[PDB]
Amino acid sequence: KAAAPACPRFDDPVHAAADPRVDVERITPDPVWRTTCGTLYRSDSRGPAVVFEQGFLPKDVIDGQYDIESYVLVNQPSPYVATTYDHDLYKTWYKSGYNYYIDAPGGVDVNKTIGDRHKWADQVEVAFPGGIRTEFVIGVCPVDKKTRTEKMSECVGNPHYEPWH
Numbered sequence: 617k618a619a620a621p622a623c624p625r626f627d628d629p630v631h632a633a634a635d636p637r638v639d640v641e642r643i644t645p646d647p648v649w650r651t652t653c654g655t656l657y658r659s660d661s662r663g664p665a666v667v668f669e670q671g672f673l674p675k676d677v678i679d680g681q682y683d684i685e686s687y688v689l690v691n692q693p694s695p696y697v698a699t700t701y702d703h704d705l706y707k708t709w710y711k712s713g714y715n716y717y718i719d720a721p722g723g724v725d726v727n728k729t730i731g732d733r734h735k736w737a738d739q740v741e742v743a744f745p746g747g748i749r750t751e752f753v754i755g756v757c758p759v760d761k762k763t764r765t766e767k768m769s770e771c772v773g774n775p776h777y778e779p780w781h
Contacts, residue, residue: 623653624721624781632720633746634671638695642682643745648728650742653781655719655754656699659712664756667716668774671750672697684743685730696743699723705739707764715759715766719779720744720752751778 629649630638640647658672674680675693687694699718706715723742731737757771 623651625651626721629722630744630746632722632744632748632752634673634697634749635677635695635746638674638677638746639682640745642695643724644683645685645729647684647724650723650725650728653719653721654701655703655717656701656723656742657703657705658697658699658716658718659706659709659714659759660716661711661713664714664772664774667753667756668750668776671753672716672744672748674745674747677746684724684726685734687743688726688730688734688736688741695745696724697747698739699742699744699748701740701742706759706766711761713759713761714756716756717754718748718752719754719777720748721780750774750776753777 630640674695674697677695680694681687681692682695687696723744726741726743727737753774754777755771755773757766760767
């Protein structure tokens with residue numbers, strides 16, 4: 617066996633952003649940025665033809681909700697795209713057709729930023745300001761809704777994924 621190396625640290629905390637107009641200075645409270653580089657996940661009903669082409673774009677980088685606690689607690693258009701550390705969080709998401717696999721630098725670690733006592737701490741979220749370019753989306757597995765399992769023979773890799781570590 618072999619021990620794992622550390623992660624490349626990018627200088628720009630929103631290097632991964634699909635929409636660079638995001639204003640890092642407006643993020644509240646003070647963000648604690650993720651410095652690890654393991655696979656993250658996103659439940660999304662949008663199909664891979666769209667996500668692989670566009671990446672994950674945020675709803676509103678201009679007038680969206682930049683306060684993380686507010687965005688977590690009350691769903692409102694925001695500059696953030698939510699992801700999770702938890703491969704299995706898709707099992708709790710009703711109706712979301714796909715479990716996307718993400719290999720992206722950075723993101724705001726929600727529980728490190730607003731604590732792990734809030735209602736949704738169990739989501740172990742990483743919030744990406746400005747979203748996530750397609751080159752950081754590994755791929756996707758569709759989810760069977762009846763059993764809350766991945767349809768592993770129907771997973772698809774993103775042709776635009778660019779490994780970086």
